Design a protein around this nucleic acid. Structure first.
Ligand SMILES: [Mg+2]
Ligand SMILES: [Mg+2]
Ligand SMILES: [Mg+2]
Ligand SMILES: [Mg+2]
Ligand SMILES: [Mg+2]
Ligand SMILES: [Mg+2]
Ligand SMILES: [Mg+2]
Ligand SMILES: [Mg+2]
Lengths: 79, 151, 99, 206, 127, 114, 100
RNA sequence: CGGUCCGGCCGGGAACUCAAAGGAGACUGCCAGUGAUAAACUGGAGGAAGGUGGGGAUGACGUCAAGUCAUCAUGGCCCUUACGACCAGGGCUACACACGUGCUACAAUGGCGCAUACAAAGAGAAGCGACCUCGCGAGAGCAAGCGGACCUCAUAAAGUGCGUCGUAGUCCGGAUUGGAGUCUGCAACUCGACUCCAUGAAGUCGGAAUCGCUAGUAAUCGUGGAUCAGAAUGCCACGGUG
């Protein structure tokens, strides 16, 4: 998928993961970063991921670690 | 060929026996411009045919050829909205060319293991006149004898 | 030792007219002159769509011919070196000097 | 049908280039942009000066611009007064030292770009197109042209439906590569649109 | 001095050197059979040595560059016949009839714009 | 013969014979005959029971047949319950790896119906 | 192309030299040397803080006069239309209509 | 020819291949037949080439208010604290289907493994990157030469020699998916290319209907290039067999 040499994450997102650990879980974390890989230090939080128009709030799980935040936010509405 | 009255290309004789008729025959079987693998199959079928029919490799080809060589064929011509099959006497050059063409076409349609086997068994069937190729000369004859009135 | 002059020009009748100027000046001021050696011409071809919109088969094919001449002077005489350096050659000819 | 550019097809046969310099892939593009930038400046400035051709050669790390003009006195001015001000900014545009040479256009009634720019300027002065064409052809023929062809296109005389009108006198062998076919374009930007002028001048064979 | 003949066909060009005695064939520092893996291509170089007799009458040093199997072979064929006229010049008449004197000007046709190949046009669709 | 997962290998050459198991392709079959010291150009004829069980012991290292099939299906279910893109496409019988669906996608969709 | 689209390329060059030529190139090769620093670097992290337009791969080769983002030729630095336009006037040296 | 580490590799040789500038040659010119003793055509001699020798460029007056105001230019109209401008994320890649152009096949004129003969034409310094080493591999690290008839991309594949499969949905065919990776690039989830391991769909030659090509052509086999950070089965181009 990518080079093994360090998985990727946004700095404006990584600083928001820290601010929620120490101060306790707040409302859905409004974030645009879809390209970031999920780390174990996220499990239990509500990260509101963009799809194009709205923020899909996805509760983090242990099985979500290793996959991108952009997999749990549908982009194309098909009905 | 509306105004232009061209002749015919004189091809180089066979690398083994020096037969112009065989040189035409190799080219007819030849696929994808692979002349090497083409003459390889023609010779391997000639080797397995002359041995299994009593040598004379030049005559073992000629025997099976006389039984597929046609004499008359139909020419689809429209005169008054209707299509009329007119019987026309074939020329010696085309006679051989047509014969050689069906031999190859019938051998390709066969269910044997190899083309050296497919070609040999079709040349054997045509020598005794009981294959797909002699039947292709027969259908051409039933058509020509029917439309005999429009000669 | 030996002075290697590599001539590059887009025009062929220009390269050997400026090559004659290098060859004649050098053999007049007494020097050992090898060549003019005609090196292979590089043909940079270009295919462009002639129509502003659509028409994929409507094309223009162009080429830039880059002619090459090699002149090797064996004797680096002070009468030769100085005569060639004060030579006025065509602006459309590139001259590469190898020591 | 569509016709091949008369100058482009004769390049190397009987017609010369307007850029004679040599460059490798590295600086070929940068030179071409500099060339277009210098020509753009010079046509803008020397607009009423009757420029017909502008040749650019690059001797070493320098530029040598040869301005072909039928009015050299106005291009040069009062003892290099106008040449020096042009050269100073040609060097600024190019980045390397500049040297401007002026070539004289003897018979301008026999120059494609000049005949074309004349017709273009006349239409913008609200003069009748048929008069402009006829005057252009007549002047060229009496001055020694073996042939001439002039074409004006689109909304002729402010018309609602565009037409392409053309006049011709003499021989114009567009297919003979050997023929001296001088060809140039000019655009008349009018009150009712664009009018494209196209001029062909046959000067003789070989 | 050696007898020379220049022969070429397609992108293949050959140089042929003739010296009397024996019937040896050296193609690019190799044997006649070592270089060519086809007997059809082997018989075409043997062709000029049939109308004009040779069994062990004259040797041949040959070098061929460019092209392919039959091309290289065809080029040599032209070279031998050119080297054979260099030796006699009366062998012309016998070499004309055979058709080896003529350089086969048949070169591959360039690919053309719009077309798939040199002549092959793409498939047409009416609707 | 009979190896690892109930299957009864044919009287065809050793390498093509082993590929018959769901979990061994052309590579594992070339290595399993290299790690047990058996030729690839030999049939099931002459291959005694002492040579069969040593190849069964070699293939038992990597998950094959039914044990592999449930693992393949587990990862598919995992994706589906997580709510990912990769899952939502195994659930909709459409190509997951990003391929075009506007046309030619008949292998995942199946045959067409007007 | 648009004036704004032309200006967007000016900015993409102006930043391509300022950073990703003399500064980002250093932290990229660092983000490849296995011999030194394997975990505590922050090089990949501080690469994100650098403006996006600074990347060389974020620039699009455009016709130097018009701005056309397609049919470009590197040799002349122009789109296929304006190449032909200058070519015919003999403004492109040594370039003529080929035939072989 | 003199010397061999047997490599044009080194003195040397300007013969030859080849390179690229100039020039000769082919004109129905000669001969014969046909033909209104004409035009021309057919055949032959000589000749490397013979009837515009082969290929390309070259596209008349014009037709279709044919195509392009989104390359550019421009009359008019329309928005001008918005139809302008900046940014992130998404989309152009959606998928009940229908049509057009292609690629790969459906195999023994063939698949696989090992050995091996022969091209042309291209591209290259923010580049082509050898040799060497590590990895099954994609690659990686180290690091020459080369702005290039010198160096590199780069082993041409068809073919040939030997062995295997033996008419089987197969050692054919490679889709789809799981697992793990590589490289580029701030960043490969949507949506990259490639590699390894595993999976082994349809298809055993296609209805009515329809397309290209007259000779180095079709058919087939590789090779290169433009665009390009990366992304060819498309396009442009090259020779091999034929
Ligand atoms: Mg399997
Ligand atoms: Mg604009
Ligand atoms: Mg880009
Ligand atoms: Mg010549
Ligand atoms: Mg003509
Ligand atoms: Mg219309
Ligand atoms: Mg296979
Ligand atoms: Mg034709």
């Amino acid at each position: 998928r990518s080079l093994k040499k360090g998985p990727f994450i946004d700095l404006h997102l990584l600083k928001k993961v820290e601010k929620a650990v120490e101060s306790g879980d707040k409302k859905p974390l409004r974030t645009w970063s879809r390209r970031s890989t999920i780390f174990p230090n996220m499990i239990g939080l509500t990260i509101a991921v963009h799809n194009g128009r709205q923020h899909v709030p996805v509760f983090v799980t242990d099985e979500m670690v290793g996959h991108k935040l952009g997999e749990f936010a549908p982009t194309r509405t098909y009905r | 060929p509306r105004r232009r009255v061209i002749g015919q290309r004189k091809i180089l004789p066979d690398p083994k026996f020096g037969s112009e008729l065989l040189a035409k025959f190799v080219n007819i079987l030849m696929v994808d411009g692979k002349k090497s693998t083409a003459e390889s199959i023609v010779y391997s079928a000639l080797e397995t045919l002359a041995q299994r029919s009593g040598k004379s490799e030049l005559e073992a080809f000629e025997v099976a050829l006389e039984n597929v060589r046609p004499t008359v064929e139909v020419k689809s011509r429209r005169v008054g909205g209707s299509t009329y099959q007119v019987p026309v006497e074939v020329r010696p050059v085309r006679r051989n060319a047509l014969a050689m063409r069906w031999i190859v076409e019938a051998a390709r349609k066969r269910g044997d293991k190899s083309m050296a086997l497919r070609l040999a068994n079709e040349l054997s069937d045509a020598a005794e006149n009981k294959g797909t190729a002699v039947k292709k000369r027969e259908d051409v004859h039933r058509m020509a004898e029917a439309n005999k009135a429009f000669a | 030792q030996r002075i290697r002059i590599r001539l590059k020009a887009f025009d062929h009748r220009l390269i050997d007219q400026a090559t004659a100027e290098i060859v004649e000046t050098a053999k007049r001021t007494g020097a050992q002159v090898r060549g003019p050696i005609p090196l292979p011409t590089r043909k940079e071809r270009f295919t462009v769509l002639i129509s502003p919109h659509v028409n994929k088969d409507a094309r223009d094919q162009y080429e830039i011919r880059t002619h090459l001449r090699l002149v090797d002077i064996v004797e680096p005489t002070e009468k030769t070196v100085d005569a060639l350096m004060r030579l006025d050659l065509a602006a459309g000819v590139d001259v590469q000097i190898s020591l | 049908g569509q016709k091949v550019h008369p100058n482009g097809i004769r390049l190397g046969i009987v017609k010369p280039w307007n850029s004679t310099w040599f460059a490798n892939t590295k600086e070929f593009a940068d030179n071409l942009d500099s060339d277009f930038k210098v020509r753009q400046y010079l046509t803008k400035e020397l607009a009423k000066a009757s420029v017909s051709r502008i040749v650019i050669e690059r001797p070493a790390k320098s530029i040598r611009v040869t301005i072909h003009t039928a009015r050299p006195g106005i291009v040069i001015g009062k003892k290099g007064e106008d040449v020096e001000k042009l050269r100073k900014v040609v060097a600024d545009i190019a980045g390397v030292p500049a040297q401007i040479n002026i070539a004289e256009v003897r018979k301008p009634e026999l120059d494609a770009k000049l005949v074309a720019d004349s017709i273009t300027s006349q239409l913008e002065r609200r003069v009748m197109f048929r008069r402009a064409m006829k005057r252009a052809v007549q002047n060229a023929m009496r001055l020694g042209a073996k042939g001439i062809k002039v074409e004006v296109s689109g909304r002729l005389g402010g018309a609602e439906i565009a037409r392409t009108e053309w006049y011709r006198e003499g021989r114009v062998p567009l297919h003979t590569l050997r023929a001296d076919i001088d060809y140039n374009t000019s655009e008349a930007h009018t009150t009712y649109g664009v009018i494209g002028v196209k001029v062909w001048i046959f000067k003789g064979e070989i | 001095n050696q007898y020379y003949g220049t022969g070429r066909r397609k992108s293949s060009a050959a140089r042929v050197f003739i010296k009397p005695g024996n019937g040896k064939i050296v193609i690019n520092q190799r044997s006649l059979e070592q270089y060519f893996g086809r007997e059809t291509a082997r018989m075409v170089v043997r062709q000029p040595l049939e109308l004009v007799d040779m069994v062990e009458k004259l040797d041949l040093y040959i070098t061929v560059k460019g092209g392919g199997i039959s091309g290289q072979a065809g080029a040599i064929r032209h070279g031998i016949t050119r080297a054979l006229m260099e030796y006699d010049e009366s062998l012309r008449s016998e070499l004309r009839k055979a058709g080896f004197v003529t350089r086969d000007a048949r070169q591959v046709e360039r690919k053309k714009v719009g077309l798939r190949k040199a002549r092959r046009r793409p498939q047409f669709s009416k609707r | 013969a009979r190896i690892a997962g109930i299957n009864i290998p044919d009287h065809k050459h050793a390498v093509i014979a082993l590929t018959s198991i769901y979990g061994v392709g052309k590579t594992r079959s070339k290595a399993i005959l290299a790690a047990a010291g058996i030729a690839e150009d030999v049939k099931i004829s002459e291959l005694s029971e002492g040579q069969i069980d040593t190849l069964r012991d070699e293939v038992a290292k990597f998950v094959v047949e039914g044990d592999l099939r449930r693992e393949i299906s587990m990862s598919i279910k995992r994706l589906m319950d997580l709510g990912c893109y990769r899952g939502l496409r195994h659930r909709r019988g459409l190509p997951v790896r990003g391929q075009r669906t506007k046309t030619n996608a008949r292998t995942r969709k199946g045959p067409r119906k007007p | 192309a648009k004036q704004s689209m032309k200006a967007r390329e000016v900015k993409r060059v102006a930043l391509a030299d300022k950073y990703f030529a003399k500064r980002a190139e250093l932290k990229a090769i660092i983000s490849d040397v296995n011999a030194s620093d394997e975990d505590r670097w922050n090089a990949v992290l501080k690469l994100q803080t650098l403006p996006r337009d600074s990347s060389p791969s974020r620039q699009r080769n455009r016709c130097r006069q018009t701005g056309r983002p397609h049919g470009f030729l590197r040799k002349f630095g122009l789109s296929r239309i304006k190449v032909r336009e200058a070519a015919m006037r003999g403004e492109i040296p040594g370039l003529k209509k080929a035939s072989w």
